[PDB]
Amino acid sequence: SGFRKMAFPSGKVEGCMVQVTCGTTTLNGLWLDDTVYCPRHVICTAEDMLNPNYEDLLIRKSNHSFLVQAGNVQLRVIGHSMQNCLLRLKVDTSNPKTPKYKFVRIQPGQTFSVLACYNGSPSGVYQCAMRPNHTIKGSFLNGSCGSVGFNIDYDCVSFCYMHHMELPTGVHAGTDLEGKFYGPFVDRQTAQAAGTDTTITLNVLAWLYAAVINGDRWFLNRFTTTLNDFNLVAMKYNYEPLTQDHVDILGPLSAQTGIAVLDMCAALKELLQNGMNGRTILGSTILEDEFTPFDVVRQCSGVTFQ
Amino acid sequence: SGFRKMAFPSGKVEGCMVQVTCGTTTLNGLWLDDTVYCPRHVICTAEDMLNPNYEDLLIRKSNHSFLVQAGNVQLRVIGHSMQNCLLRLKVDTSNPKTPKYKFVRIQPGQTFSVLACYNGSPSGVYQCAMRPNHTIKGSFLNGSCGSVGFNIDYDCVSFCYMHHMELPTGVHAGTDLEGKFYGPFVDRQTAQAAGTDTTITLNVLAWLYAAVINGDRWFLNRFTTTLNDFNLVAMKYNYEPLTQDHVDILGPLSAQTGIAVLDMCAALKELLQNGMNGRTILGSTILEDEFTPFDVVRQCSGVTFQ
Ligand SMILES: *[C@](O)(C(=O)NC1CC1)[C@H](C[C@@H]1CC=NC1=O)NC(=O)[C@H](CC1CCCCC1)n1cccc(NC(=O)OC(C)(C)C)c1=O
Ligand SMILES: *[C@](O)(C(=O)NC1CC1)[C@H](C[C@@H]1CC=NC1=O)NC(=O)[C@H](CC1CCCCC1)n1cccc(NC(=O)OC(C)(C)C)c1=O
């Protein structure tokens, strides 16, 4: 038992991290097969960043304007292309530590592991969620650009995030591994801000199931609710509306615990209306929304503490 | 910016994890050079566990009563010895992925990364603290025995924890890599329980410094306090007494933020007496005690958001 924000083991990803330099700018890139991926703003200086024209900044570079380092070893770049907001650098060596991998675009509310890196050197790993407002509440300092987010399924690494920038509120924005931003953000220094966020309702419910699997039932009640009565309360508390799809996703957990989804919703509505009264759930005094239903089944016992 | 419970990248440790079987019991072990370390209770069956005599249970095993698997590859055991609550299995192959490493016994209040493993396969990584009561609030299911805790300094892995058991409250107990238990616990099924825990005062203070480095000052005040006046309040709130040594450790953070330690103590005393009033610090509504002063300097900017 116990319940912790757990990250995926980071080994398969550590073996892919490199340093990419272009003039004065050093950041991290990702080395799979004979390609190195990195944020395209590695070609920018400070002043370039107010209003960069990337096509224009890139045409005046060569293969040799990019220095790639895997630990000690310099890698020779022999090709370059822009893909959306990344650069693809073709390199003379295939990464021998290339894991089985895929590139996925994760959906808001989904979770992944971030390997925070500086100068191609991994410094730390943590789990976080794609917020409904398409940001992440990361921990990132200068030099962290190029750090990746990923999930692991069996032996297959699903890369889903590359870090690009911090927004004014201190939250983080970036791209999938095709270089498309998550959210409405662009890779220029402008007046852009995180949209208003909302609580991930499906995750809070998954975590209440986690708390019951772990043998805690204090916050349950004898009431039920309609979806629509739940959603009127959800809106007032800045929670995402629950849908039948989200009710269907909570099925397995519902069955494992024998608590119907709409009963757990009655419990949540009561938790939202009456607070927790200095009480805790799985050690927390707030309602946690950065665990998916999949994260709960992954980490929890397949047999309830009844 | 941002602040997250960050773990060390787990790669160096993943490459050391193996499966150890003895009759019916399978758990994890750690393969450095030509030794495999694992909990000694791997030689026990269910009934053995009420009152095992390990010396007696071990003398009736041979080298070949132990099956060691590194992925596919079976390793041949050619030696065995008990060291306190571990077994050392000498093995015919030196682990080629052996990192530079050390074995340390960490002190209560210190933090480390756990690589949760099942059947020698790493499943997840998370950060936690050695509690003053010598337990950890881990996340561990059946099969997790042998999972290790570690810190990384440059390229050197400091192993400090091996998992052995869950106590009645759902918290976890285990040994250093010499097989000495942390706390008063023994590797038998008896009526043993976690002692009463206390909040790690030094860590809470380090985390308030983190919140100020990150540009939040709301909870500060114009008061100061004596150590002794602080400690009278600490005792009533089940916080550890603060000492001059702990004041000295907070020096660097004190200087980086220009807030004197006893002023931050006045802030904490006020936070303890008056609660937070639905306010947050680095996103939390409770006072966090699982970051050391070292963890804060590691993760935070070396320049304050003034
Ligand atoms: C990234 O480029 C990087 O690390 N590059 C290596 C040379 C160092 C950084 C990483 C940021 C910085 C702090 N945490 C991070 O996440 N990215 C940037 O600095 C941003 C550069 C981008 C260039 C093109 C895309 C848009 C910007 N960048 C630039 C300017 C301002 C911010 N954020 C910011 O001003 O900080 C706070 C919220 C306002 C105080 C930014 O990320
Ligand atoms: C460990 O031996 C293991 O995983 N072995 C592989 C064959 C599976 C487990 C891991 C525990 C179980 C659940 N989470 C974990 O941390 N360790 C044990 O099961 C304990 C065996 C020890 C044998 C010698 C040392 C003392 C016990 N063990 C045995 C009995 C009871 C508990 N805990 C317990 O009863 O659970 C809760 C708190 C009471 C509900 C225990 O860990």
Numbering used by the authors:
A (entry chain AAA), B (entry chain AAA): 1 to 306
Sentences from the paper on this structure:
One of the best-characterized drug targets among coronaviruses is the main protease (Mpro, also called 3CLpro). Along with the papain-like protease(s), this enzyme is essential for processing the polyproteins that are translated from the viral RNA. The Mpro operates at no fewer than 11 cleavage sites on the large polyprotein 1ab (replicase 1ab, ~790 kDa); the recognition sequence at most sites is Leu-Gln↓(Ser, Ala, Gly) (↓ marks the cleavage site). Inhibiting the activity of this enzyme would block viral replication.
Previously, we designed and synthesized peptidomimetic α-ketoamides as broad-spectrum inhibitors of the main proteases of betacoronaviruses and alphacoronaviruses as well as the 3C proteases of enteroviruses. The best of these compounds (11r) showed an half-maximal effective concentration (EC50) of 400 pM against Middle East respiratory syndrome–coronavirus (MERS-CoV) in Huh7 cells as well as low-μM EC50 values against SARS-CoV and a whole range of enteroviruses in various cell lines, although the antiviral activity seemed to depend to a great extent on the cell type used in the experiments. To improve the half-life of the compound in plasma, we modified 11r by hiding the P3-P2 amide bond within a pyridone ring (green ovals) in the expectation that this might prevent cellular proteases from accessing this bond and cleaving it. Further, to increase the solubility of the compound in plasma and to reduce its binding to plasma proteins, we replaced the hydrophobic cinnamoyl moiety by the somewhat less hydrophobic Boc group (red ovals) to give 13a (see scheme S1 for synthesis). The plasma half-life of this compound in mice was increased by a factor of ~3 relative to 11r (from 0.3 hours to 1.0 hours), the in vitro kinetic plasma solubility was improved by a factor of ~19 (from 6 μM for 11r to 112 μM for 13a), and the thermodynamic solubility increased by a factor of ~13 (from 41 μM to 530 μM). However, relative to 11r (IC50 = 0.18 ± 0.02 μM), the structural modification led to some loss of inhibitory activity against the main protease of SARS-CoV-2 (IC50 = 2.39 ± 0.63 μM) as well as the 3C proteases (3Cpro) of enteroviruses. To enhance the antiviral activity against betacoronaviruses of clade b (SARS-CoV-2 and SARS-CoV), we sacrificed the goal of broad-spectrum activity and replaced the P2 cyclohexyl moiety of 13a by the smaller cyclopropyl in 13b (blue circles). The P2 cyclopropyl methyl moiety fits snugly into the S2 subsite, which has shrunk by 28 Å3 relative to the complex between compound 13a with P2 = cyclohexyl methyl and the SARS-CoV Mpro.
